[PDB]
Ligand binder design. Structure first.
Ligand SMILES: OC[C@H]1O[C@H](O[C@H]2[C@H](O)[C@@H](O)[C@@H](O)O[C@@H]2CO)[C@H](O)[C@@H](O)[C@@H]1O
Ligand SMILES: [Cl-]
Ligand SMILES: [Zn+2]
Ligand SMILES: [Zn+2]
Length: 431
């Protein structure tokens, strides 16, 4: 990073050009230039490059991965005023709260919807169970019924969760990380149905985002499953399409994992005041969010002034109907392991290299696997009396060490007085 400049990272499927237009407006008003980038596998790249002090000032992703970043000390605590908080819907703030602190700015609510081709299929199906017969009928006309991304577990999760599949058990405002629900009856029923669609040649196992998107946008498949960002390319196409409630499975709603696109501030960034300026007064405005939305649609934005009007479009109404039927994703550190384990299971089951039961049993263990993590005592680095020690502490606790190595590193870089009288060491001992 560089003082007086902002660098922002955001996913390739989002409105990066539109975000850049907001950046041009920020530079014209204030003289601070904004560079928008969309690197590949940005959600894994950010925690890597923040360990090297080579991260952006601002990072965009769905809120589920932010708790992990915050745990690891990669995010500054943001400081919106009461007046500003009131401009956004309370629940979007709830998605960015981690151990009591606001760790990112909420942007927009994301939910998966069923997208169908009104000409090939004027009445979309209300249940998953009727889709196989629909494909047989459409195959007679050289088409298919449904194609969606089988490589990302986000797209398959609504079916997995419909009859009972869950990520982490939620008991009184707390997620139990030892209780993973990806191997219960409901999860197996859902994944088995997908696998049976593949075996019965109503779907193929290699379908991914580009393939499904191409099939739907060129009138070859009657349906896909995707989020607001995908409407842009469909609008550009000649397809007459609708966006509606996901089909039910075993009489239950499909439960998508709902994402809140969020903008976090790099803890290592020297531009935290400029990042706050840009996010609060330029991006989180009607004119800013419209600039991004115009490019790729955001969905149900967190800003009330804009959302009150935007929700008039039926596709946004559909996103909200789908989101209300599902659950806000957890923001806990364990979400990254949960996602990776379900990704393996679905691919391995869909390809037939494992059985549903074998794939999902492995996922339960891996999603529950506890990690060694010292980053839980990062807050003690803030009680250091010197600046040099606070930073030395942050790097020691961040950097993969054993406990012996953390204790020894802190002694080397952070002993200024006797240990029993030092507030940083008193904090560390208790923690
Ligand atoms: O695929 C698992 C994946 O799900 C989500 O990623 C979503 C993201 O929420 C959407 O904004 C859009 O970019 O599509 C993605 C699906 O590939 C989670 O947020 C993510 O952490 C997770 O790995
Ligand atoms: Cl890249
Ligand atoms: Zn194409
Ligand atoms: Zn084609």
């Amino acid at each position: 990073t560089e003082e007086g400049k902002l660098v922002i990272w955001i996913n390739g499927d989002k409105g990066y050009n539109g975000l850049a237009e907001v950046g041009k407006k920020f530079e014209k008003d204030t003289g601070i230039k904004v560079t928008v980038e969309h690197p590949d596998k940005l959600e894994e790249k950010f925690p890597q490059v923040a360990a090297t002090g080579d991260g952006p000032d601002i990072i965009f992703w769905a809120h589920d991965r932010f708790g992990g970043y915050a745990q690891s000390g990669l995010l500054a605590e943001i400081t919106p005023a009461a007046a500003f908080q009131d401009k956004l819907y309370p629940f979007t703030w709830d998605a960015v709260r981690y151990n009591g602190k606001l760790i990112a700015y909420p942007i927009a609510v994301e939910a998966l919807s069923l997208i169908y081709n009104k000409d090939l299929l004027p009445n979309p199906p209300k249940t998953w169970e009727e889709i196989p017969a629909l494909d047989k009928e459409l195959k007679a006309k050289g088409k298919s019924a449904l194609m969606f991304n089988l490589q990302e577990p986000y797209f398959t999760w609504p079916l997995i969760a419909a009859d009972g599949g869950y990520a982490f058990k939620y008991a009184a405002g707390k997620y139990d990380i030892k209780d993973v629900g990806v191997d219960n009856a409901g999860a197996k029923a859902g994944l088995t149905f997908l696998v049976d669609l593949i075996k019965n040649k109503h779907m193929n196992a290699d379908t991914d985002y580009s393939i499904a998107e191409h099939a739907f946008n060129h009138g070859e498949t009657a349906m896909t499953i995707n989020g607001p960002w995908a409407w842009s390319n469909i609008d550009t196409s000649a397809v007459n399409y609708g966006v509606t409630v996901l089909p039910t499975f075993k009489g239950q709603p499909s439960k998508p994992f709902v994402g809140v696109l969020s903008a976090g501030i790099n803890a290592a960034s020297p531009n935290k005041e400029l990042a706050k300026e840009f996010l609060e007064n330029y991006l989180l405005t009607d004119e800013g969010l419209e600039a991004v939305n115009k490019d790729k649609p955001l969905g149900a934005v967190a800003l009330k002034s804009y959302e009150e009007e935007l929700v008039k479009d039926p596709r946004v109404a559909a996103t909200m109907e789908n989101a209300q039927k599902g659950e806000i994703m957890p923001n806990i550190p364990q979400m990254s392991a949960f996602w990776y384990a379900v990704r393996t299971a679905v691919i391995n089951a869909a390809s037939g290299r494992q059985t549903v039961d074998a794939a999902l049993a492995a996922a339960q263990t891996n999603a529950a696997a506890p990690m060694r993590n010292p980053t839980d005592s990062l807050y003690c680095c803030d009680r250091a009396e010197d600046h040099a020690c606070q930073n030395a502490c942050k790097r020691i606790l961040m950097s993969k060490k054993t406990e012996m190595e953390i204790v020894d590193g802190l002694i080397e870089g952070c002993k200024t007085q006797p240990l029993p009288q030092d507030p940083l060491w008193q904090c560390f001992l208790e923690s």
